[PDB]
RNA sequence: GAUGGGGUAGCAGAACGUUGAGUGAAUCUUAGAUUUUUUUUUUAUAACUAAAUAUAGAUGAUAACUCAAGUGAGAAUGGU
């Protein structure tokens, strides 16, 4: 695979050494700034998953700490970090009614919408050691 | 990683871990064929009153 | 606005300028010291053990002082023999030889005079009653403002302020 | 009657037993769900998971109850939580090292862990209730678990006459969490503050037993993983367990002990002076180094808050987020052990 | 959500900013060359900048509903810079709903009764959202005719150097270099 | 009235009112725990069935 | 623990808009205070409110046993030299309760009953309109001073529980964005 | 002197370290006489056996309930319940509803407001005007 | 109400009022308001 | 096999055996209406 | 990795609800049928869970399918 930059190989230990770290994962192209332990509530029902399934996220746009920040041009290389989540199940919203109406017309058309949402749980977010790479 | 799911038209699918690699789907008309722990399997586990972990393991 | 989506756009705030300078055809680690207060878990290099390898030059180096507010000076002007006089005068006439009088006579802090001596109980109870009679003169509007001052000080030391 | 046959076939001499029989555990759907909910290894039969729910208040015999199972489990929890706290925060004062232990393996968190497992309590202990329910008697407070702590001779005078109790002595006499040792029926009543403690005490003994049942059947490493998954995985901000008294005096003593130059408070930034809600940002400097920082509405409050943050930074020093544990050596051959940082102690100031 | 979790005490505090209506402003001036030709910020260009501070829009936590604005002390409002003949040809109007009671006054005639501070309050007042926070925000604009004001102690500082002072930038860069000596 | 009088004894307990010492009910004119001659003697003419 | 008497007065010959003002006048006062205000009121119904308020008190003492601790409570004040209780009603009025059993008008409202009658109004142009003669009732809830001493302590505890005023509050930023702005 | 506060306990994060399915019980009420329970009887004979085998951490209780529509009442760890009436539903429609209770939680439905919910502080502290390079008006 | 002739029920409740207030009789909770089996 | 009634649930929880004693202690009809008889005040008046 | 998605006059299709009727000499109900409320859940003009209040063994209620209409009202200076 493409070798990691020398500048990133010399500053990553300082990034992984600081107390806290955050990441901006990308699910289907949309970003989500999360940290280990956060509960992500996706705005869609992920098909083909059940509560207790482990997902390996591999599209990270930005991984950084307080002072430093690692940025990949399209995305950060997968070999540098390891972010995993667990499906916490599905959640729904209260049924909302939209009334489409025009003035001086009695017909009121109703639209009933009740969407489901997949809830994740970031249970791992660590930076790998690239001393070998 | 996936958990044990029941496919309506294919049967019970055992848990699989892709990191260590196996989608095996067992179907039948008896609980034992599905591959899950039944009441019979829970009674033999209770009668094995002789099993004991190693001394060093404790 | 009319919809929750239109509101989000009107209330938008762009990310920091440092994040906009995204690399091109490569990954890099940029140095972005935030304009925020650091937590207590960022131990300073002066508190790190000598064995801790994490000690390292400033991250900036890898790529006078402000005004004085409180600088006290400890003084020891009371000799061992003078401490006995402070204990005899206080117990002899606590009304005349108050801690303020003894503090100025021996050039000490009012707290120190109380460290080596304590007025008799009959005089201490008289001091508490004095402050208890002054508290009854406060109205509902002042008695509640003085109670908050005592609650804000406790909350401050509990980490809640 | 003839129209309503019994749903659960039971002998006539069943409502008189203290707790359901062992074989009753093999026909309850709650145990089979609770056993699989926790992913317990199949080496733990349903008869054992049923014994971890029978509190000593429901059964008086040394067997059939949860007395001895909870003790062996309490030792593992108290041990794995202690060594992990000293490796993560080796400078924590002894007073806060107890609140942190009680905040993880105390009756309060364990009660939440028991409820997070879907464990429903029984109304009254009896042989008719299904073994899948936590059964205890909150009306009887005579239940107690053997503790390694000893009774203080001055206990009588301690609570009455407000005598002093040193922190250094709590390590030998007091309990594991620093507390002092030994500190017909009519149901026409309401809940009491004592029954609330008895119910909370029953839940704690259950979670501890499950760690004991895993220890006897699955071994040591299996119990450590269980404690490391449910108890250690919880979150706690130790910075909020601090309550300082005269912090400026303690910070001056800290620098004096480590030979650092006297701390000096400097006004980094200020605004709104002579207002209702000003902001004074002061920083305590030990010569040229900046120890702590604080921003309050009063000049004194800003200096005090700066001292606390300078102390918290000293006590909250952590070698790493996931530090090695001395128990990692008694397992299968691993890398050699490296000496851990041992703090000299907390600062005792005026 | 973690971004917001923390101590927001200092993010909502009221900062006391300061600006002089006579000091040349390379950013708010239309003349940018030569150095000696740079003018101060015009009335409307200064009010547009102040209105942004009174709204707290310069903060990354701005919300139109929360009154997270700041204070602004403007001095030397007597030497308010204006272009053309605005000072003598601009007119301010008034009406109390009684026909015939149309009050008119020019800028210079309005600067003789209430000084240049009143001309700047009308400019900032029109640039603020017309709602229930308009009077609270406009009250945080303390404009004075000369260099004197009662807030010389309130102005935000950084190491004893008031912002806008000759050597205020050096005092800021010295405090950040000391904050980097920590994990 | 007995539906409302029984719920008060259960709740009030030691403060249950002395209804026997109360006034008459103007809706019918009867004292507490007392019938009316028309109902105690059953003098009300009934149908033939 | 607390005694209470709900008394519904008889059918008074007046309207709701007329009697509503005589019920708000006795609200919160003691039975003795209200009886003195109805005796010197120029309203014709003030005489009917005084008689009904005396009957309500006669039932409060016999049926409910209210206001039967004056002799015992009076002793603790003069015999032991005790300090009376100082409370503050919901409206802010300061009281000095020396007898916790003193009966007072806790709640009061007025309802409208049946129609007294109908009078015909013969106007011009041969028009006729019915004039309804009203008939309203009043319901007073009497309680002892033990209820006010409790409702006051609850108000005080609710204020000391709202914490003190902090200069720099930690107000939340209620807007999430998947990036850092600082 | 530093005194410890004894009123703060740890909080649990389900999913970090160990995952516990919230649904702990599922009641399946049918009727032998009601016509609306014809499909529920088919779900209990063909789809419940295997669906109950794949979810060993859920207690299933099949009991009759004549003169009443069929319902799927699930009990969760938080203490709340969710009952779904499946009258006039085919067996495969019962399974799609049973999976809704299995995946769901006791929490009430809420409108989508914010994706991420966090309890730990910001890695980069909240913005402060006194910890930056200053601002010149 | 002020003109209604006082009946024997109101003449009896006024004599009891003078007995309780004076202190002759001591008030006690009712025992015939309802016939319950609990008796508490 | 049959409908689970509020009595069955109490038996599983263990409360039922306690309810029998109290209801029996107060002479109350455990699982029944008793032997008191129906309301016969309006019936004696000829109510249809 | 199917295609399609505004709508008046107007045309067409598919359903719910209300009243009564058949299966019905059926089913269920003090181990609570029924209770104009409140609450809870489900793609929801509807039904459902629970709670509170009262107490019915049938002149009570009732699924499912079908039959027949005095079957659905913010609008007529509408009527009571
Ligand atoms: Mg005429
Ligand atoms: Mg379209
Ligand atoms: Mg009801
Ligand atoms: Mg008809
Ligand atoms: Mg109409």
TrEMBL record, chain A:
Question: Keyword annotations for this protein?
Answer: Ribonucleoprotein, Ribosomal protein
One CC-aspect GO term:
mitochondrial large ribosomal subunit
Give the Gene Ontology MF terms in alphabetical order. Answer: structural constituent of ribosome
Keyword 4Fe-4S listed: no
Record flagged with keyword Ribonucleoprotein = yes
Annotated TM spans: none
Family to which the UniProt record says this protein belongs? Belongs to the bacterial ribosomal protein bL21 family.
Q: What is this protein called?
A: Large ribosomal subunit protein bL21m
Organism equals: Neurospora crassa
Q: Taxonomic classification, please?
A: Eukaryota, Fungi, Dikarya, Ascomycota, Pezizomycotina
Automatic annotation (TrEMBL), chain B:
**Lineage: superkingdom:** Eukaryota
Q: Where does it localize? A: Mitochondrion
Q: Which family does it belong to?
A: Belongs to the universal ribosomal protein uL30 family.
Record function comment: Component of the mitochondrial ribosome (mitoribosome), a dedicated translation machinery responsible for the synthesis of mitochondrial genome-encoded proteins, including at least some of the essential transmembrane subunits of the mitochondrial respiratory chain. The mitoribosomes are attached to the mitochondrial inner membrane and translation products are cotranslationally integrated into the membrane.
What is the protein name for this chain? Large ribosomal subunit protein uL30m
Q: Which organism is it from?
A: Neurospora crassa
The gene is B14D6.300
Q: Which residues of the full protein are shown?
A: 82 to 161 of 161
From TrEMBL, chain C:
Q: Which domain of life is it from?
A: Eukaryota
Q: Annotated Gene Ontology MF terms? A: structural constituent of ribosome
For this UniProt record, the keywords arranged alphabetically read as follows: Ribonucleoprotein, Ribosomal protein
**What would be one Gene Ontology cellular-component term for the protein?**
mitochondrial large ribosomal subunit
| UniProt keyword ATP-binding, yes or no | no
Taking the record's annotation, the residue ranges forming a coiled coil are none
Name used for this protein in its record: Related to ribosomal protein YmL20, mitochondrial
* UniProt source species: Neurospora crassa
Which residues of the parent protein does this chain contain?
Answer: 41 to 225 of 225
């Amino acid at each position: 695979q493409p070798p990691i930059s020398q500048q990133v190989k010399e500053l990553l230990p300082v990034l992984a050494a600081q107390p806290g770290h955050y990441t901006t994962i990308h699910i289907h192209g949309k970003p989500y700034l999360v940290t280990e332990g956060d509960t992500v509530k996706l705005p869609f029902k992920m098909p083909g998953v059940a509560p207790g399934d482990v997902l390996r996220l591999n599209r990270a746009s930005v991984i950084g700490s307080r002072d430093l920040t690692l940025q990949g041009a399209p995305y950060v290389d997968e070999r540098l970090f390891e972010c995993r989540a667990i499906v916490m199940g599905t959640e729904s919203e209260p049924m909302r009614v939209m009334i489409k109406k025009k003035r001086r017309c009695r017909k009121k058309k109703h639209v009933f919408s009740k969407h489901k949402y997949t809830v994740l749980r970031i249970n791992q977010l660590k930076i790998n050691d690239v001393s070998s790479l | 990683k996936q958990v044990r799911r029941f496919i309506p038209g294919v049967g019970v699918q055992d848990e699989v871990d892709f990191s260590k690699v196996g989608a095996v789907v067992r179907d039948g008309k008896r609980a034992g064929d599905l591959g899950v722990r039944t009441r019979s399997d829970w009674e033999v586990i209770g009668k094995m009153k002789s099993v004991l972990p190693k001394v060093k393991a404790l | 606005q009319s919809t929750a989506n239109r509101t989000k756009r009107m209330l938008n705030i762009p990310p920091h300028e440092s994040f906009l300078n995204v690399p091109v055809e490569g990954d890099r680690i940029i140095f972005n010291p935030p304009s925020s207060e650091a937590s207590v878990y960022h131990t300073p290099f002066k508190f790190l053990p000598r064995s801790d390898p994490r000690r390292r030059a400033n991250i900036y180096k890898l790529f006078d002082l402000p005004p004085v507010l409180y600088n006290p000076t400890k003084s020891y002007n009371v000799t061992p023999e003078q401490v006995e006089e402070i204990r005899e005068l206080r117990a002899k006439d606590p009304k005349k030889y108050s801690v303020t009088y003894l503090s100025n006579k021996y050039n000490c802090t009012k707290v120190f005079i109380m460290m080596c001596t304590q007025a008799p109980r009959e005089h201490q109870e008289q001091h508490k009653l004095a402050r208890a009679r002054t508290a009854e003169n406060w109205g509902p509007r002042r008695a509640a403002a003085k109670l908050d001052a005592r609650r804000r000080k406790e909350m401050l030391h509990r980490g809640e302020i | 009657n003839d129209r309503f046959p019994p749903l659960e076939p039971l002998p006539p001499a069943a409502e008189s037993l203290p707790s359901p029989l062992p074989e009753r555990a093999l026909t309850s759907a709650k145990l089979a769900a609770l056993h699989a909910r926790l992913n317990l290894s199949p080496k733990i039969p349903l008869q054992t998971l049923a014994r971890t729910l029978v509190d000593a208040s429901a059964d008086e015999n040394p067997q059939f109850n949860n007395a001895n199972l909870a003790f062996v489990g309490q030792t593992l929890i108290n041990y794995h939580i202690a060594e992990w706290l000293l490796c993560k925060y080796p400078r924590l004062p002894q007073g806060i090292l107890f609140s942190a232990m009680k905040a993880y393996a105390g009756p309060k968190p364990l009660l939440q862990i028991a409820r997070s497992w879907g464990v429903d309590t029984a109304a009254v202990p009896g042989g008719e209730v299904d073994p899948g329910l936590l059964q205890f008697d909150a009306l009887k407070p005579g239940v107690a678990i053997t503790n390694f702590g000893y009774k203080r001779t001055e206990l009588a005078y301690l609570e009455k006459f407000k005598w002093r109790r040193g922190m250094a002595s709590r390590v030998v006499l007091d309990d594991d969490f620093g507390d002092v040792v030994r500190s017909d029926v009519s149901y026409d009543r309401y809940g009491n503050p004592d029954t609330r403690a008895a119910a909370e005490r029953a839940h704690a003994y259950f979670v501890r037993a499950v760690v004991g049942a895993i220890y006897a059947h699955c071994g040591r490493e299996a119990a450590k993983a269980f404690v490391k998954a449910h108890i250690m995985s919880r979150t706690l901000d130790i910075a909020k367990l601090f309550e300082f008294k005269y912090p400026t005096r303690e910070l001056a003593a800290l620098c004096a002990r480590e030979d650092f130059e006297p701390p000096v408070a400097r006004l980094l930034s200020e605004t709104g002076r002579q207002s209702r809600t000003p902001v004074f940002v002061v920083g305590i400097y030990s010569g040229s180094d900046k120890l702590g920082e604080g921003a309050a509405s009063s000049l004194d409050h800003a200096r005090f808050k700066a001292a606390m943050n300078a102390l918290k930074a000293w006590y909250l020093y952590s070698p790493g987020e996931n530090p090695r544990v001395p128990s990692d050596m008694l397992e299968e051959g691993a890398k050699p052990w490296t000496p851990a940082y041992i703090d000299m102690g907390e600062v005792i100031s005026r | 959500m973690s971004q917001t979790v923390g101590a927001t005490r200092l993010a909502y505090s009221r900062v006391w900013h300061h600006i002089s209506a006579v000091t040349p402003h390379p950013t708010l001036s239309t003349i940018k060359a030569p150095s000696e030709a740079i003018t101060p910020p015009s009335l409307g260009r200064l009010a547009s900048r102040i209105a942004t501070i009174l709204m707290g829009k310069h903060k990354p936590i701005w919300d139109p509903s929360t009154d997270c604005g700041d204070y602004v002390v403007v001095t030397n409002c007597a030497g308010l810079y204006t272009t053309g003949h605005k000072k003598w040809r601009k007119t301010y109007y008034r009406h109390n709903t009684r026909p015939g009671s149309l009050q008119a006054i020019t800028m210079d005639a309005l600067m003789e009764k209430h000084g240049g501070a009143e001309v700047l309050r009308k400019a900032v007042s029109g640039m603020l959202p017309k709602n229930r926070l308009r009077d609270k925000r406009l009250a945080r604009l303390k404009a004075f005719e000369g260099d004197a004001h009662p807030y010389k102690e309130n102005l935000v500082r950084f190491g004893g150097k008031v912002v806008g002072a000759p050597g205020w930038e050096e005092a800021v860069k010295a405090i950040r270099e000391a904050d980097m000596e920590r994990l | 009235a007995a539906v409302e009088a029984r719920n008060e004894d259960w709740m009030l307990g030691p403060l249950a009112p002395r209804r026997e010492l109360d006034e008459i009910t103007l809706s019918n004119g009867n004292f507490f725990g007392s019938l009316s001659p028309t109902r105690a003697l059953l003098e009300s003419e009934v149908s033939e069935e | 623990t607390e005694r209470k008497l709900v008394y519904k007065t008889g059918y008074l010959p007046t309207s709701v808009k007329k009697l509503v003002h005589l019920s708000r006048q006795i609200r919160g006062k003691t039975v003795s205070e209200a009886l003195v205000q109805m005796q010197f009121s120029k309203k014709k119904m003030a005489k009917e409110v005084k008689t009904e308020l005396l009957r309500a008190e006669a039932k409060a003492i016999v049926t409910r046993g209210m206001g039967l601790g004056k002799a015992a409570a009076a002793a603790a004040q003069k015999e032991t030299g005790a300090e009376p209780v100082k409370i503050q009603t919901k409206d802010g009025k300061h009281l000095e309760i020396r007898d916790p059993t003193r009966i007072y008008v806790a709640e009061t409202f007025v309802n409208k009953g049946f129609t007294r009658g109908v009078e015909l109004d013969y106007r011009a142009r041969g028009r006729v309109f019915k004039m309804n003669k009203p008939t309203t009732t009043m319901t007073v809830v009497l309680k002892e001073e033990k209820t006010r001493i409790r409702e006051h302590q609850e108000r005080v505890a609710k204020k000391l529980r709202q914490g003190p005023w902090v200069h720099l509050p930690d107000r939340p930023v209620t807007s999430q964005r998947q990036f850092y702005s600082w | 002197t530093v005194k410890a506060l004894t009123q703060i306990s740890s909080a649990g994060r389900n999913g970090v370290g160990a995952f516990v399915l919230q649904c702990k019980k599922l009641d399946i009420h049918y009727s032998d006489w009601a016509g609306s329970s014809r499909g529920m009887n088919g779900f209990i004979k063909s789809l419940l056996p295997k669906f109950a085998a794949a979810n060993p951490q859920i207690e299933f209780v099949v009991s009759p309930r004549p003169a009443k529509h069929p319902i799927l009442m699930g009990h969760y760890i938080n203490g709340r319940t969710k009952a779904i009436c499946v009258r006039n539903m085919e067996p495969l429609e019962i399974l799609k509803k049973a999976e809704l209770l299995r995946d769901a939680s006791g929490e009430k439905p809420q409108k989508f407001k914010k994706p991420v919910t966090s309890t730990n502080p910001s890695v980069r502290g909240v913005w402060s005007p006194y910890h930056g390079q200053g601002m010149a008006v | 109400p002020s003109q209604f002739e006082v009946t024997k029920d109101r003449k009896a409740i006024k004599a009891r009022q003078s007995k309780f207030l004076s202190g002759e009789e001591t008030w006690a909770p009712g025992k015939v308001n309802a016939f319950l089996n609990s008796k508490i | 096999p049959r409908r689970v009634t509020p009595v069955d649930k109490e038996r599983m929880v263990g409360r039922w055996k306690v309810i029998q004693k109290e209801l029996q202690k107060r002479e109350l009809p455990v699982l029944g209406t008793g032997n008191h008889g129906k309301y016969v005040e309006l019936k004696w008046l000829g109510s249809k």
